Structure formats: structure tokens, C-alpha cells
Design a protein around this ligand. Structure first.
Ligand SMILES: CC(=O)N[C@H]1[C@H]([C@H](O)[C@H](O)CO)O[C@@](O)(C(=O)O)C[C@@H]1O
Ligand SMILES: CC(=O)N[C@H]1[C@H]([C@H](O)[C@H](O)CO)O[C@@](O)(C(=O)O)C[C@@H]1O
Ligand SMILES: [Mg+2]
Lengths: 520, 104, 104
């Protein structure tokens, strides 16, 4: 778009419109973009430092930044989240509309103690979207820098970096270097705007419900089965302990031995740790007792891992060591902050279909019983996909990620992104933004040496994102009332999800989606 | 093609995560070894503990043998140490088996 | 409305105006902490309001003259409803509306 300097290039579109089976959200925020890296790319490495082989990395930092609207509180206000989670069985993304407008480039001059900031009306910010996914996709790794939950909050734009292959601190012949100046990008003075629109692929609805039934309780409790199972191997009503083979048919007085059609979901057990520090071991096991994976002689913790229940009935005090998502409160520090500065999610409502993360999967025969060799079973702590298995994927949270790019691989098994959300062959693309460098005054004699002297400058503008979501309506024939999410009627000093007296918005708990119920 | 990136190096190295993970279970800066629960958020100085979206491929480990005969065991293990499958009371070596990297 | 006037199901709506925040220069390293540093700025403009009122005409068959509102013919140092010598407008008395009369 073309406009004079004194002429808005867009309006503040933020709203929340529901119609039928669709909810269209639009959120507008204002962003600050600084010069990053001094308009330079810089090779970045784990060289020096001596970080453990696990942490060794090689890659690049970029002069560009990016936009990230991959969190639900980017487009769903908490009261809108409630409308979703309280009345819908599912939902998914469908289309997306993005706009960059009202961009103002400013020049900064520092003389002595005093700094002056003036408008540079001829400078340009450049935006481009990686629609062919040619750049390393850095979204979908739960990074900060996303659009803020509170529309009145101004955010800084995160800087783009990526990585490639690394052996230790060194690189390899295949490792890749990307110059974002190589792509075509739209240049904008304060009069220009920028827009694009995107359609999501077909993906399934997310499960904004819990099961009112469990896998081991699907049968009719009033009706014996016609199937029989081997019941005893030692005779009932015998004076000694004499060998026998006694068969019984399925009965309600024994749901635990009735033949069944299905298996619980896959499991990959994690250590159980109590929220009350006393019960725990007096050691520092978050690594040595970690459930981890082993890629290229390099260990990386599994978190959040295969979707499993967080604790059993009545054991609310526990949690898997790396098998739940944990959001920090606004106060929490960056490292080694106390329990009550963070919020731990509880995926307990899937215990209906999925193993508890802290427990075994089951028991397995491991020998051939005979009159001589006593039978033997062992426990299963890793259980891969078996035919018959049914499972519920890990739930999403107002604060949590929305989607992820499915890695481009020959093969993938059930590629829901492990942290929750939609796994997309072709996600929404990255939007890269950079301030055009503005050289200061060159010398009066020619010098072919790289230009290192630039007007210090930063830019600010608004950003608009419209997303149409589909809803899956609830058709439940349940008589009794369902569980619903609700603010606490009682009194307190602070409304939930609000600014305080200093003006700080705070999200008090994580809100997931599984409240309505349906049969299994 | 080959991948210019690995599963554990897909994140942005300049940007902390908003996710937190349980970091210590024994207090830092305590005179004794006192129990604690200390949480840290994802950081580039620790790619190995950052929450991630994906798992590596399936594995079915096989014995490692060196091309230089000295380093190897003084036995004939190509069967006794073989990773095999068991069909109808009959053993058959797995070769080439699930697709895995050949050396680190 | 008890203080006088028209009680409206749907009155004239509120007009909310705000200056867009203008961030000053961010740091050169990223920081996801809320932005607290802005160019101090204020705005000025004109505002226009046109209102059409209906009048109910007086049809009175009263013979004698009605009471009417009137500035005081006599002399004084200050015209009513005016600026003074420093330039301050002042409204000297409250003026209501009930002057004409009609039968009950
Ligand atoms: C319903 C149930 O769990 N039945 C189990 C019983 C019970 O433990 C006893 O009947 C206790 O009264 O024990 C068995 O060894 C048996 O005796 O056949 C196995 C069977 O699975
Ligand atoms: C980045 C990394 O691997 N961090 C790990 C640290 C490091 O070994 C120490 O910080 C060494 O400086 O050890 C832990 O037990 C801890 O202390 O929290 C577990 C954590 O996973
Ligand atoms: Mg509306």
C-alpha cells in the first residue's frame, strides 16, 4: 500500500466474533524492532564454555527478527477460551490473515548523557514470509517473543537464529548457511503496509473433552460373557495343592479378567517426584534418573514425551519428572526458581485411555513355566505401538503452543507435536522482519572495506492476525451436568487474568480444554 | 538428500523458551545436601534439557564390530551375539534391519 | 434521570480516545519483558458535535404577559455570561427552563 507519511496504513482490528460452527478471532499488537547483531550475521558456536557434549551446538544469528503468534492467548482471550472449553467437543485452525501496518522507523543519536530519538521518514523495514519453507523453521519450539496475552502490552520482536549439523563445537560439510538477503522481501517506509493470508491443511479436531468411560469399563455389568478364560491352575476344594485346569466365563464380579478388545496407549515411564520435597530422594536426579533419548552420541531429555496420565486416582501430589508442561508465573526467575513461581499442568483426565506416566505399562511372561520352573513375569517400562491401542493426545493450554511443523522425514508415527497442538506438513510460514541498514557518512576517499558505521535506528509498528477456527459442537446425551471451568464466585483481592495495581497482567493458572465429556 | 539439521538442534539458539523444566532436586548454595525443587526455563546454554516436539526413530540395537580386527573380541560371535528374530521356533538374523546410523 | 434530563435505553455512546504508544529504542539483545520505555507524547485536535433538537411551540391563550428570563437592564461592571479582564468566562447563575406557563 501507498500512503503519505501522515496517513494511517491500518486500523486496530482486534475482536472476537462467533457465528454458528466457527469462531473468528482477530488480535492486533504493537511491536518494537531493534537493529540486531549490527546488521551482521555471526557464526555462533558452543566453542569455549566447555558445555557437555549434550549441549554442543553450531549455527547462526541473523540480523532479522521474526513474528510468532503460536500461542493461544495470542488470539483467545480467557473468556473466549472459556466459551471454547465449556461448550465445544473440538476445534482446529482453518485460515489465517496477517497484516503489518503503521510502521515508524526512528533514528537514535547519543551525545554525552542525553539521548535523542527522532523520526527517519525515508527508512525502510523489510518483511518477507518463508512460504516455501526454505529457511530452518524455528517456530514450534516453545520460544518466547510471541504476541502478548494482554492486547495493551507492547512487545519486542525476537531475533531470528537457526542451527545446522554439529560435531562438538565444529561443523560438518553438510551444515547449511542461510542469508535472508537472498530472498525477495517487501520494503516499507512509514507509508507502506504488508499483508498475506494462509490456509491450514485439513487436520483433526483437538479433543476438548474427557472420556466419561475407561478402557477396562466398556462392557455391560449385568451380562456374563460367552467367552471363557483359564481361571485356576490349582484345584479348588482339594485337600492338598493338586494341579488342575479350571475355566470360568466372563462375569461382572471380575471385570479384570474378561477378554477385551483394546489396549491402553503406548507408555515410556518417567520418574515420579512429589510436590512435597520431604518424600523425595536426597539426591539431584533430574539428569541421572532422567528418561532421555540418545541421538548421535548425545543425550537429550524427553519432555514432555509420550502422552501419559500425570497421577492415578487420589495421588494428586505426584508428577512425572519431565512428562508434564510447566508454565512459569510472571515473577519466576530464569533458572532454579521455587515451586510456587511456576504452574504445573495435570493431564490426569486421560488416565481413562492412557498409561500413568510414572507407572509400568504391564506385566509380561519371561520364561516357560513347568512343574519344575516357576512362572515369571517382568514389568514393561517402554511399550511401543501395538495393534489394538487407543490413546488421547496431550491436551492444549491457553498458554501453550498451537501448532508445529511436522519434520520432513521419510517416516513419522502419529505426528501430533509432543507439546500439544496440530502437526502440520505446511504450517503457517515464518515472517522475517529486518530494519534496512542506513549507512552514516562514508569517507571522502574510496574504501572497498566493509561498511561498519551506521545510524543507530529502531522501528515500531502494529501487527494484525485474524484466524478463523472451526468448532465441533457437543451433542452429548448426558443427563447430569458436566464439569465446567469457572472463576471462583467467592471474594479475593484480585480478579483472575487481570492487571494488578502496578499494571501487570498475570495468568494465574494453566487452562486446558478437556471439560465436556463423551463416551469412549 | 541428507538433513542439514538434527532433531535436537531445531530450536532458535538466541531465545529462551517460555517452558520450564524441573532443574535441581538438591539445593544449590546450601551448606549441606538439602532437598529442593528448583525449576529453570529453556536456555541455549542447555539445549539437552529444553522441551522438544519430537522423538528419534525406532531402534533395535545391533552389536558393534571394528574394521580393525584387534579391537574385537576373541570369539566367533556373528551368531551367538547376533540380533535375530524368532519365527516358528526358527531363528533368522535381522539384516539389514531397522534403519539406523552406522557410527557416531 | 434524577439529576434532570432524558433517560435513554440507548443513549449517545461513549467515544474513547487514546494515543498509540510509541516505544523508544529497545536494547540490541532480545528481552521478552514488557516494554516500559516510550517517547513522551501528547496530542491535540478539534472536535465537532452537531445536534438537532425538536421544539414544542407555545400555544397559550393567556391574556396577560408571561414571566420571561432577562438580563438586568440596569448598569453593572460586568456583562452576564462573559470573560472578565483576565479572560475568564463565568456563568453567573443557573438558568432553568420553566418560564412560560400552561394550565394543569
Ligand atoms: C475376579 C478375579 O480377579 N479372579 C481371580 C481369582 C481371585 O483372586 C479369587 O477368586 C479371590 O476370591 O484368583 C485366581 O487366581 C483364581 O482363583 O482363578 C485368578 C483370577 O483372575
Ligand atoms: C544444561 C544441563 O545439562 N544442565 C544440567 C545440570 C548441569 O550438569 C550443571 O548445571 C553443570 O553446570 O545438572 C543438573 O543436575 C542441574 O544442576 O540442574 C541437571 C541439568 O539437566
Ligand atoms: Mg462483535
Amino acid at each position: 500500500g501507498a500512503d503519505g507519511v501522515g496517513n494511517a496504513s491500518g486500523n486496530w482490528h482486534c475482536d472476537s466474533t462467533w457465528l454458528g460452527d466457527r469462531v473468528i478471532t482477530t488480535s492486533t499488537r504493537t511491536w518494537a524492532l531493534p537493529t540486531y547483531n549490527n546488521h551482521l550475521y555471526k557464526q555462533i558456536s558452543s566453542a569455549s564454555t566447555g558445555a557437555s557434549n549434550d549441549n554442543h551446538y553450531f549455527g547462526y544469528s541473523t540480523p532479522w527478527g521474526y513474528f510468532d503468534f503460536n500461542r493461544f492467548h495470542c488470539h483467545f482471550s480467557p473468556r473466549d477460551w472459556q466459551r471454547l472449553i465449556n461448550n465445544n467437543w473440538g476445534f482446529r485452525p482453518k485460515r489465517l490473515n496477517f497484516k503489518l501496518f503503521n510502521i515508524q522507523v526512528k533514528e537514535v543519536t547519543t551525545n554525552d548523557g542525553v539521548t535523542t530519538i527522532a523520526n527517519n521518514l525515508t527508512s525502510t523495514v523489510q518483511v518477507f514470509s518463508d512460504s516455501e519453507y526454505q529457511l530452518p523453521y524455528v517456530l514450534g519450539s516453545a520460544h518466547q517473543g510471541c504476541l502478548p496475552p494482554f492486547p495493551a502490552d507492547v512487545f519486542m520482536i525476537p531475533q531470528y537464529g537457526y542451527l545446522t549439523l554439529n560435531n562438538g563445537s565444529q561443523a560438518v560439510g553438510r551444515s547449511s548457511f542461510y542469508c535472508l538477503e537472498y530472498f525477495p522481501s517487501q520494503m516499507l517506509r512509514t507509508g507502506n503496509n504488508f499483508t498475506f493470508s494462509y490456509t491450514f491443511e485439513e487436520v483433526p479436531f483437538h479433543s476438548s473433552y474427557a472420556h466419561s468411560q475407561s478402557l477396562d469399563r466398556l462392557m455391560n455389568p449385568l451380562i456374563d460373557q460367552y467367552l471363557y478364560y483359564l481361571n485356576r491352575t490349582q484345584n479348588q476344594s482339594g485337600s492338598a495343592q493338586n494341579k488342575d485346569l479350571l475355566f470360568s466365563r466372563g462375569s461382572p464380579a471380575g471385570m479384570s479378567v474378561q477378554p477385551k478388545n483394546w489396549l491402553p496407549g503406548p507408555c515410556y515411564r518417567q520418574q515420579r517426584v512429589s510436590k512435597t520435597k520431604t518424600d523425595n530422594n536426597n539426591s539431584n536426579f533430574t539428569w541421572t534418573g532422567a528418561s532421555k533419548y540418545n541421538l548421535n552420541g548425545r543425550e537429550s531429555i524427553i519432555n514432555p514425551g509420550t502422552a501419559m496420565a500425570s497421577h492415578k486416582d487420589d495421588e494428586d501430589k505426584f508428577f512425572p519428572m519431565s512428562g508434564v508442561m510447566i508454565f512459569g508465573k510472571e515473577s519466576a526467575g530464569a533458572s532454579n526458581t521455587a515451586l510456587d513461581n511456576v504452574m504445573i499442568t495435570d493431564e490426569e483426565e486421560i488416565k481413562a485411555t492412557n498409561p500413568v506416566a510414572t507407572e509400568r505399562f504391564g506385566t509380561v511372561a519371561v520364561n516357560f513355566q513347568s512343574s519344575s520352573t516357576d512362572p515369571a513375569t517382568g514389568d514393561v517400562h517402554a511399550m511401543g505401538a501395538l495393534p489394538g491401542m487407543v490413546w488421547q493426545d496431550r491436551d492444549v493450554y491457553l498458554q501453550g503452543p498451537i501448532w508445529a511443523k511436522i519434520p520432513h522425514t521419510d517416516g513419522h508415527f502419529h505426528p501430533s507435536p509432543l507439546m500439544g497442538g496440530f502437526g502440520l506438513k505446511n504450517p503457517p510460514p515464518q515472517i522475517l522482519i529486518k530494519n534496512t541498514p542506513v549507512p552514516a557518512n562514508p569517507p571522502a576517499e574510496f574504501s572497498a572495506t566493509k561498511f561498519a558505521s551506521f545510524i543507530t535506528q529502531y522501528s515500531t509498528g502494529q501487527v494484525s492476525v485474524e484466524i478463523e477456527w472451526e468448532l465441533q459442537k457437543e451433542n452429548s446425551k448426558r443427563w447430569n451436568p458436566e464439569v465446567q471451568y469457572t472463576s471462583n464466585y467467592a471474594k479475593s483481592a484480585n480478579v483472575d487474568f487481570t492487571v494488578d495495581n502496578n499494571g501487570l497482567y498475570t495468568e494465574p493458572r494453566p487452562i486446558g480444554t478437556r471439560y465436556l465429556t463423551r463416551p469412549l
